[PDB]
Design a protein around this ligand. Structure first.
Ligand SMILES: O=C(O)CCC(=O)C(=O)O
Ligand SMILES: [Fe+2]
Length: 199
């Protein structure tokens, strides 16, 4: 249960293969990299971005940049497959006007994890975030408006799309260590795309 959240399991099943081809295309321009947090610690999840803006870590904290700090070049353009799926999911969830200008791409290797955090780097917290999972299943955990609220667990599997809007948009959340396994399309990892209106 998550007020404001719209869970569309297997919604992206049909576009999965194409999405994976485009993730590889994006990674060819802006390679996956394990960003270092302001405290000086390497994240276990590997990331990259496509679209006008990209989420990244900085010395002063977190922020969106139109330039890839590693390549010093713009992030790859938002592929059509990405925009089309996000549009259908957003509209289906009730957000037909949602127009993302950034897509953070996370890659989870076996054991990779993402500790509890809030996504508050966006200008308007009223705009939802569309999440698309691919490959191996992962346990998504979330709490409440506070970092010490009751944590709930939700398994996200290949093709699962969740539109995080309303109150859920501000919930603390994370991903538990990815259990080892095999998937025909991603082999041994999980991918997650999150579309955001960062501009
Ligand atoms: O991988 C996930 O399902 C969570 C992605 C996320 O919330 C983020 O990276 O900010
Ligand atoms: Fe997040």
């Amino acid at each position: 249960l998550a007020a404001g959240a719209v869970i569309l399991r297997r919604f992206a099943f049909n576009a999965a293969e194409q999405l994976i081809r485009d993730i590889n295309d994006v990674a060819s321009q802006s390679p996956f990299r394990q960003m270092v947090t302001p405290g000086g610690y390497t994240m276990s999840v590997a990331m990259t971005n496509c679209g006008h803006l990209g989420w990244t870590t900085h010395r002063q904290g977190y922020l969106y940049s139109p330039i890839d700090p590693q390549t010093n070049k713009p992030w790859p353009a938002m592929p059509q497959s990405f925009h089309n799926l996000c549009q259908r999911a957003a509209t289906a969830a009730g957000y037909p006007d949602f127009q993302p200008d950034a897509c953070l791409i996370n890659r989870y290797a076996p054991g990779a994890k993402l500790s509890l955090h809030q996504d508050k780097d966006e200008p308007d917290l009223r705009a939802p975030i569309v999440s698309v999972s691919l490959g191996l299943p992962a346990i998504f955990q979330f709490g409440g408006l506070k970092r010490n609220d009751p944590l709930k667990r939700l398994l996200l599997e290949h093709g699962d799309v969740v539109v995080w809007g309303g109150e859920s948009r501000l919930f603390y959340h994370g991903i538990q260590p990815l259990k080892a396994g095999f998937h025909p399309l991603t082999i041994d990892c999980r991918y997650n795309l999150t579309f955001r209106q960062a501009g």
